């Protein structure tokens with residue numbers, strides 16, 4: 001679990017969005033596993049606007065942060081799950097690191113701010129949904 005709170009927006013994994021997220025929907029994209037909902041309170045986070053390929057993510061299944069080198073946002077095949085059919089997930093960045101399904105929502109940050117959230121994984125792999133291209137989050 002986990003979310004980004006920026007301005008009057010809440011960014012979550014689309015497959016973990018609540019009834020309240022859907023009732024206050026701003027934007028969602030199944031191909032990215034993202035959903036953004038509106039909030040009444042002002043957020044605590046800021047978004048990176050950069051091309052960093054290194055950063056640190058929070059791994060809830062280890063209660064620890066880990067440093068990672070990750071690929072640029074790309075279209076990557078993701079196997080079927082209870083949440084989605086087998087498809088290409090877009091704007092996804094992969095890295096070597098530990099992850100389990102419940103780790104989705106953990107934030108990846110670089111020196112500039114929030115880069116994205118955990119969305120996929122594998123055997124010693126962790127994949128992050130990028131949010132740096134969503135310029136409207138800042139206004």
Ligand SMILES: CSc1ccc(Br)cc1CC(=O)N1C[C@H](C(N)=O)CC[C@H]1C
Pocket residue numbers: 015033078081082083084089099100101102103104118119120121122123
């Ligand atoms: C951190 S998730 C994870 C971690 C390790 C392993 Br093995 C396997 C996973 C599962 C995984 O990749 N997905 C991706 C899915 C999606 N984004 O299409 C939504 C959550 C889940 C079902």
Ligand SMILES: [Zn+2]
Pocket residue numbers: 048049050051052110111112113
């Ligand atoms: Zn950066």
